[PDB]
Swiss-Prot record, chain D:
Family: Belongs to the UTP5 family.
Organism (species): Saccharomyces cerevisiae (strain ATCC 204508 / S288c)
Protein name per UniProt: U3 small nucleolar RNA-associated protein 5
Residues of the full protein shown: 2 to 358 of 643
GO biological process, one term: maturation of SSU-rRNA
Note, other: Present with 33100 molecules/cell in log phase SD medium.
UniProtKB/Swiss-Prot annotation, chain E:
WD repeats: 42-94
Protein species of origin: Saccharomyces cerevisiae (strain ATCC 204508 / S288c)
Subunit structure: Interacts with snoRNA U3. Interacts with MPP10. Component of the ribosomal small subunit (SSU) processome composed of at least 40 protein subunits and snoRNA U3. In the absence of snoRNA3, forms a complex with other t-UTPs. This complex can associate with pre-18S ribosomal RNAs.
Subcellular location: Nucleus, Nucleolus
Name of this protein: NET1-associated nuclear protein 1
Lineage: Eukaryota, Fungi, Dikarya, Ascomycota, Saccharomycotina
Swiss-Prot record, chain F:
Subunit structure and binding partners: Interacts with snoRNA U3. Interacts with MPP10. Component of the ribosomal small subunit (SSU) processome composed of at least 40 protein subunits and snoRNA U3. In the absence of snoRNA3, forms a complex with other t-UTPs. This complex can associate with pre-18S ribosomal RNAs.
Parent-record interval covered: 9 to 64 of 896
Name of the protein in question: NET1-associated nuclear protein 1
Note: Present with 6560 molecules/cell in log phase SD medium.
Species this chain originates from: Saccharomyces cerevisiae (strain ATCC 204508 / S288c)
The protein's role, per its UniProt record: Involved in nucleolar processing of pre-18S ribosomal RNA. Required for optimal pre-ribosomal RNA transcription by RNA polymerase I together with a subset of U3 proteins required for transcription (t-UTPs).
Cellular location(s): Nucleus, Nucleolus
UniProtKB/Swiss-Prot annotation, chain G:
Protein source organism: Saccharomyces cerevisiae (strain ATCC 204508 / S288c)
Coiled coil: none
Shown stretch of the complete protein: 239 to 476 of 594
Record family assignment: Belongs to the WD repeat UTP18 family.
Subcellular location: Nucleus, Nucleolus
Chain positions of WD repeats: 8-47, 52-96
Protein name stated in the entry: U3 small nucleolar RNA-associated protein 18
Other notes: Present with 9570 molecules/cell in log phase SD medium.
Function: Involved in nucleolar processing of pre-18S ribosomal RNA and ribosome assembly.
Subunit structure, as described in the record: Interacts with snoRNA U3. Interacts with MPP10, UTP21 and UTP25. Component of the ribosomal small subunit (SSU) processome composed of at least 40 protein subunits and snoRNA U3.
RNA sequence: UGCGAAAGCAGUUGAAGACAAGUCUUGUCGUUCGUUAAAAUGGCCUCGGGAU
């Protein structure tokens, strides 16, 4: 997951997620959380979605 | 998010005895006949060589006391159980008792016999009484208080008695081994002077030790046999030795994975470790320049670096040793809540691992073939790149100058079995990608010529191995 | 830098108070100061680990 | 010393009102003993202090040092009415029986108030009463015919005579409690004193002297002399069982203590004892009051309650495992 | 309830209806990087069989590791057997033994059967 | 004697429509931001964010 | 009576902070402990204490959101490349068995300008285009650099640069109209040159002046209105 | 399952099982506040 | 694509419609019917007042 800083065009990373990122959102009046949808494309027999709510402050999984 | 996985690149009893790395070699004026360890801290050991006894500091591994009063050759330096006294026997037949660390004063001097006194050992359970065995073939049992007549005079040996042992937990029992090949057990509680019985070794007995309260292990001739007092027959016997086994030592309850060890000298230059818990089977060995006459290992309660000592007839003494802002320190012992969120840094990565982590495929291959690079570690990076699917990718931007380091290793790695299959993959790709450049490069050609000769040589070996394999199947 | 180095300045007169601190006022190496939002309390921490409270009776 | 300056259970014993200081200002709060409320009545003046606090049958009347009595309604969280005496002398004590409200000033002047009419009915001063730190109006019928008053001795006064009736030899120190257990039997305790004297009103003889282990700060009587629980200054609660049945001096039978799991002792600052249940109250953190109900009849003689308090607590985040590895993250492969 | 996801295992608690763990049981490019473009044609090792002893203290896994394409050794599948142990209190299985190419080279382990309680106290298994 | 009953859950629900992008997530966070409501194909789970448990 | 007397500190008191409304005093130092005492003037008992392993405290502060009075937070930093936030809201201060601690350690590309989090301050910034108000954490950089972060999300909002070595800074507020205010960052050089930045306008300089006769400046502070020591509880009180 | 019941999995990832007084008003008001 | 073992053994790709480029010839498909049937320079965080 890449946060592009648009003022300076910089970017912050959160790598090694469980799956490829299908959807991204910033949730909160102050951007407290990031809600991501992960896909886990390794399993071709099915589409395996995992919903991950991260804490914006420290990018730690608040709820998977 | 998960932390990045790290790239994944003998017996425990052997690994422990491997640790006696530091080897110090000393010269003595004559053959070192006996070696003994002080039972108490600092557990200094005494070596009997020529006409003197020298005590070595455990930590310093250097002589700290020298007992040079003996006019003729000395034949023992055994300490008492508490370690204050040491007794020594002389070829003249005089047995002398000195205070350890005080060579000057002589506490007690006894004339056991006119013949040589080869063995002088303190009784382990009783401090007062001292045992002496002489070429007179009588193993007198002395008392320090009574220096004029032995308490008891064991007899019955028809040849030289050079071995004497006290069975632990049996103060009344005494074991003596003679060159007759007989090991005689005596009872000091009774009248004595006649063995309870005799155990036949069939070869001259050169040393007898009591491994446990019921088991005694005697080394004579080319083998050592363990005898059980309760059954009065040898349980086991090992004859791995080539020359005549001379000395043997036993240490129990030390910090090794193995509970107990039996050290045995050989006189072929070998001293080997035997495990009593696994039926006295070989587990370790050392080789020395010449025949070994004495062996010793530091006691169980060494309290410091452990020592293994070997004594050679040339006088050499071999030692192997196993070496053993005012609020910054608060730690919050009085506080309600203690929060610890620090994480230790990951162990240092190598250059090739950093390149793979950063997706530097070409540079990771370069790190593989660098001077002083372990062959196994070179094989991992080649396997990692293949697993990542980056074998052609690592080989695009290359010419003859930077291709030779890979081909040089392939020339040597084709010979190894583990790397043979990997070398075939990498060599197959480089030929498919650099066929044209090879035509215009003369140096690349000869690398392939010698590669073709070696790979042809490997084919013959593999064809050969199949034939022996067919042969082996026919036998079975 | 030194012990008891603390002064209170009246505003807008910009005149340092004379009666306090005194020679007997225990302040130590002043390293932290705080005023309560209301109530006129003054907290002064020092290099010894001691926080001392004073009340300004005017507030 | 305790952060709780004053405290008092309601007559039913289910709510505790306590006064504490925030910075320089006192705040009055009420908590439900049986089971948090963030609402306090704040005194806007640093000088103003609560001298007295008495439950009204949901109102609490607070004696002030300003010389006036504030009737405080807990629900609205505001003072409905303020009874102001003509003088400015601080109120030492107050007591209530229905509409009858009696108080005393530091000037030793008695006053009477009517809650229904909100009027100062009468005020008077009785000679031979130089100091007055306690006032208790005796329960005779449905009217007040006599008052128990004590400063260092104890005296009985009749309202209509406006004169003393009987005097009891009290403690050396100022009297701190003057509760009446039953008819012709009231107990008395003093500041920094370990002795409680039981006096007979009709006669005037010391029936008994109950002796506590340490200084007494509070006192609660159960039923009609059935039991008496006294909070000691050292933080332990003593219970006296049948104090009114050698005979002159009696000691406590049961003792109750609080200690944390780590080992620290937590003092008890107030307690309530109704029929067979005892309520204990202690402070956690700085000023938060915590409670516990127990059946003292079955409790052994020396009983120590054990409570869980934070002490060297390793901080566990719900989002991390023991090793700081995020719960969402997968476990890596290690040979 | 153990689900052998590709190259990993999901431990799922159907009483609570919530996943209790996700553990990688094989080597490969699992979470070292995100595969893009041609790297996305790579096949990680597949956990073909997963079984428990009757006692339940031991986990037996069988893996097939596939070679990359476009190589000489692009058709020599590797078959691996692994034995893991785990104390009941912890949640992570620990690899105790690894057997590479059991039953020979390129010979699949088509069946695994843990032993009954009678033999070895359930400390054995058959591979066929 | 025997009977069948569904016990465990199923996959989380998603707005599985090709055209809509970035609006696939249907799970909603409470106005107090104390719990996350997530629809499954066979139920709706309410997780408490603070304690990380399915409260309802 | 002394505040520490109930539970003493094992090192020097590096920072002190009174809670904006509640009667609590916060203490911090190189002991690595955050002790909170209930200041009544007479007893001063300890509400709670939080040891942070290997996190020396050079400064600490309470923070209350200017809009949501129920949001309560403590920020603490030291000579480290991270900062800790402790959410004290709801019942976390007293009743909770554990502490909700967050570590800020990401500078979003500006790690070179920032070496340590030890010197910092917290202010209120109003996003004028939406009228919403939140808190910001200001830091001191290497080369005149002031890095401003979001208080909750930790995102890097803006950076301000002065010439010379940045020695100290402070925050001043200017109300504009009903429900509006502007945050000014005041930063000073050791030489004595003072910059004033407009944090509501990307932190562009709005005023430059020099301290008359200043040399070897060490500190700068504003007083008489809302500040870190006298914070507001509503917009109208700015 | 090692109990009597059998657990079955259905391709919608569904696991089924086949097997055999003024005080009272004051308290309420205080709670509301 | 089907069966099979991993070895292999059999077989499979067509009709349109729309548009872009050249200038009538070619490509492409966020389009249909049927058949078991490479390449936008773009690489993965931080948490080291007093004595006198």
């Amino acid at each position: 997951m890449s946060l592009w800083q648009l003022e300076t065009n910089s970017q912050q990373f959160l790598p090694r997620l469980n799956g490829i990122i299908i959807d991204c959102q910033v949730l909160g009046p102050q951007g407290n959380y990031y809600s991501l949808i992960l896909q886990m494309t390794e399993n071709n027999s099915n589409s395996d979605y995992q919903f991950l709510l991260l804490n914006a402050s420290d990018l730690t999984s608040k709820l998977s | 998010s998960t932390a990045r996985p790290r790239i994944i690149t003998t017996t425990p009893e052997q690994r422990y005895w491997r640790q006696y790395t530091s080897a110090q070699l000393v010269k003595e004026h004559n053959s070192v006949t006996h070696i003994s360890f002080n039972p108490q801290h600092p557990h200094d050991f005494a070596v009997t060589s020529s006409t003197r006894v020298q005590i070595f500091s455990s930590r310093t591994r250097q002589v700290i006391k020298t007992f040079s009063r003996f006019k003729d050759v000395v034949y023992s330096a055994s300490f008492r159980s508490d370690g204050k006294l040491l007794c020594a026997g002389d070829a003249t037949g005089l047995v002398s008792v000195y205070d350890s660390y005080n060579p000057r004063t002589i506490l007690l001097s006894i004339n056991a016999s006119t013949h040589p006194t080869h063995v002088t050992k303190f009784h382990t359970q009783d401090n007062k009484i001292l045992a002496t065995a002489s070429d007179d073939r009588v193993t007198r049992l002395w008392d320090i208080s009574n220096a004029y007549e032995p308490q008891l005079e064991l007899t019955g040996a028809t040849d030289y008695v050079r071995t004497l042992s006290f069975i632990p937990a049996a103060p009344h029992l005494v074991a003596t081994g003679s060159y007759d090949g007989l090991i005689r057990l005596y009872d000091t509680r009774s009248s004595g002077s006649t063995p309870i019985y005799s155990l036949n070794h069939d070869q001259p007995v050169e040393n007898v030790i009591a491994v446990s309260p019921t088991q005694i292990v005697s080394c004579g001739g080319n083998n050592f046999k363990v005898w059980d007092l309760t059954s009065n027959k040898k349980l086991y016997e090992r004859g791995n030795f080539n020359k005549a086994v001379t000395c043997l030592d036993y240490v129990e309850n030390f910090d090794s994975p193995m509970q107990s060890a039996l050290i045995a000298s050989s006189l072929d230059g070998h001293v080997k470790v035997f495990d009593p818990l696994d039926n006295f089977q070989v587990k370790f060995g050392w080789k020395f320049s010449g025949p070994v006459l004495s062996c010793a290992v530091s006691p169980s309660t060494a309290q410091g670096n452990r020592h293994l000592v070997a004594g050679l007839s040339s006088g050499l003494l071999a030692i192997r040793t196993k070496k053993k802002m005012r609020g910054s320190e608060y730690q919050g012992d009085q506080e309600h809540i203690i929060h610890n969120d620090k994480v230790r840094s990951q162990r240092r990565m190598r250059a090739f691992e950093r390149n793979i982590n950063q997706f530097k495929w070409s540079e990771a291959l370069d790190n593989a073939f660098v001077p002083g690079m372990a062959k196994e570690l070179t094989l991992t990076v080649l396997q990692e790149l293949r697993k990542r699917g980056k074998v052609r990718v690592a080989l695009y931007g290359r010419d003859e100058s930077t291709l030779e380091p890979l081909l040089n290793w392939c020339l040597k790695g084709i010979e190894d079995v583990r790397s043979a299959s990997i070398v075939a993959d990498w060599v197959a790709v480089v030929l498919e990608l650099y066929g044209n450049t090879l035509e215009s490069s003369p140096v690349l050609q000869e690398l392939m010529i010698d590669l073709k000769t070696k790979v042809r040589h490997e084919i013959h070996k593999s064809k050969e191995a199949q034939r022996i394999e067919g042969m082996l199947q026919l036998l079975t | 830098a030194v012990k008891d180095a603390l002064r209170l300045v009246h505003l807008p007169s910009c005149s340092v108070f004379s009666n306090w601190p005194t020679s007997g006022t225990p302040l130590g190496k002043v390293t932290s100061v705080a005023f309560s939002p209301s109530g006129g309390l003054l907290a002064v921490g020092n290099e010894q680990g001691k926080v001392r409270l004073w009340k300004l009776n005017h507030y | 010393d305790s952060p709780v300056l004053q405290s008092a259970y309601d007559p039913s014993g289910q709510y505790l009102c306590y006064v504490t200081v925030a910075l320089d200002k006192q705040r009055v709060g009420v908590q439900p003993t049986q089971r948090w409320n963030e609402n306090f009545l704040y005194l806007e003046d640093s000088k103003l202090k609560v001298t007295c606090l008495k439950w009204v049958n949901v109102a609490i009347i607070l004696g002030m040092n300003n010389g006036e009595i504030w009737l405080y309604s807990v629900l609205a969280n505001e003072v409905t009415y303020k009874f102001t005496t003509g003088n400015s002398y601080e109120i030492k004590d107050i007591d209530l029986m229905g509409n009858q409200l009696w108080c005393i000033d530091s000037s030793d002047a008695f006053y009477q108030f009517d809650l229904l009419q909100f009027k100062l009915l009468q005020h008077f001063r009785i000679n031979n009463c130089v100091q007055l730190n306690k006032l208790t109006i005796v329960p005779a019928g449905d009217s007040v015919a006599q008052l128990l008053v004590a400063s260092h001795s104890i005296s009985l006064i009749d309202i209509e005579e406006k004169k003393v009736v009987m005097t009891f030899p009290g403690h050396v120190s100022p009297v701190s409690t003057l509760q009446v257990i039953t008819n012709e039997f009231f107990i008395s305790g003093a500041e920094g004193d370990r002795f409680l004297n039981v006096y007979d009103i009709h006669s005037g003889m010391t029936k008994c002297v109950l002796v506590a282990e340490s200084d007494i700060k509070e006192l609660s009587h159960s039923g009609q002399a059935d039991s008496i629980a006294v909070t000691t200054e050292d933080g332990s609660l003593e219970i006296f069982v049948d104090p009114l049945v050698g005979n002159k001096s009696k000691k406590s039978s049961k003792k109750i203590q609080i200690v944390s799991k780590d080992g620290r002792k937590v003092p008890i600052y107030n307690a309530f004892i109704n029929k067979d249940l005892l309520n204990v109250s202690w402070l956690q953190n700085a000023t938060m009051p915590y409670f516990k109900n127990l059946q003292w009849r079955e409790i052994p003689n020396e009983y120590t309650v054990e409570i869980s308090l934070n002490w060297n607590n390793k901080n566990k985040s719900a989002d991390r495992d023991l090793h700081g590895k995020d719960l969402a993250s997968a476990t890596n492969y290690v040979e | 309830l153990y689900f052998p996801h590709i190259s990993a295992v999901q431990i799922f608690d159907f009483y609570k209806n919530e996943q209790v763990n996700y553990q990688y049981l094989t080597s490969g490019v699992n979470n070292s990087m995100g595969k893009v473009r041609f790297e996305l044609n790579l096949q990680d090792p597949i956990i073909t069989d997963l079984k428990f002893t009757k006692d339940g203290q031991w986990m037996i896994t069988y893996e097939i590791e596939y070679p990359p394409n476009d190589l000489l050794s692009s058709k020599d599948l590797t078959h691996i057997l692994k034995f893991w142990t785990k104390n009941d209190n912890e949640t992570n299985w620990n690899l105790k033994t690894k057997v590479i190419n059991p039953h020979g080279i390129s010979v699949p382990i088509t069946k695994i059967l843990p032993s009954p309680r009678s033999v070895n106290n359930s400390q054995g298994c058959l591979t066929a | 004697q025997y009977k069948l009953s569904v016990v465990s859950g199923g996959k989380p629900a998603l707005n599985n429509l090709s055209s809509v992008t970035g609006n696939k997530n249907i799970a909603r966070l409470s106005q107090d931001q104390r719990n996350y409501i997530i629809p499954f194909n066979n139920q709706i789970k309410v997780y408490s964010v603070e304690t990380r448990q399915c409260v309802k | 009576k002394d505040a520490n007397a109930s539970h003493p500190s094992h090192s020097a008191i590096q920072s002190l902070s009174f809670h904006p409304s509640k009667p609590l005093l916060l203490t911090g130092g190189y002991d690595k402990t955050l002790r909170i005492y209930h200041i009544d003037g007479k007893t001063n008992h300890l509400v709670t204490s939080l040891h942070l392993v290997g996190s020396p405290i050079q400064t600490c502060t309470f923070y209350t959101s200017l809009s949501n009075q129920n949001q309560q937070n403590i920020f603490t930093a030291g000579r480290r490349r991270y900062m800790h936030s402790w959410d004290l809201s709801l019942e976390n201060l007293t009743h909770s068995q554990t502490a909700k601690i967050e570590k800020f350690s990401r500078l979003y590309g500006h790690e070179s300008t920032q070496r340590s989090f030890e010197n910092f301050k917290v202010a209120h910034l109003q996003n004028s285009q939406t009228n919403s108000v939140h808190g910001i954490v200001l830091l001191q950089g290497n080369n005149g650099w002031i890095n401003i972060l979001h208080s909750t999300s930790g995102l890097w909002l803006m950076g301000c640069k002065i010439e010379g070595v940045i020695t100290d800074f402070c925050i001043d507020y200017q109300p504009i109209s009903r429900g509006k205010f502007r945050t000014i960052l005041i930063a000073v050089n050791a030489y004595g040159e003072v910059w004033e930045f407009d944090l509501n306008k990307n932190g562009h300089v709005i005023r430059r002046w020099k301290d008359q006769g200043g040399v070897g400046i060490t500190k700068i502070q504003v007083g008489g209105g809302t500040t870190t020591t006298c914070p507001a509880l509503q917009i109208s009180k700015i | 399952n090692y109990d009597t019941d059998f657990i079955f999995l259905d391709i919608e990832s569904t696991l089924g099982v086949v097997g055999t007084s003024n005080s009272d008003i004051f308290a309420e008001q205080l709670h509301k506040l």
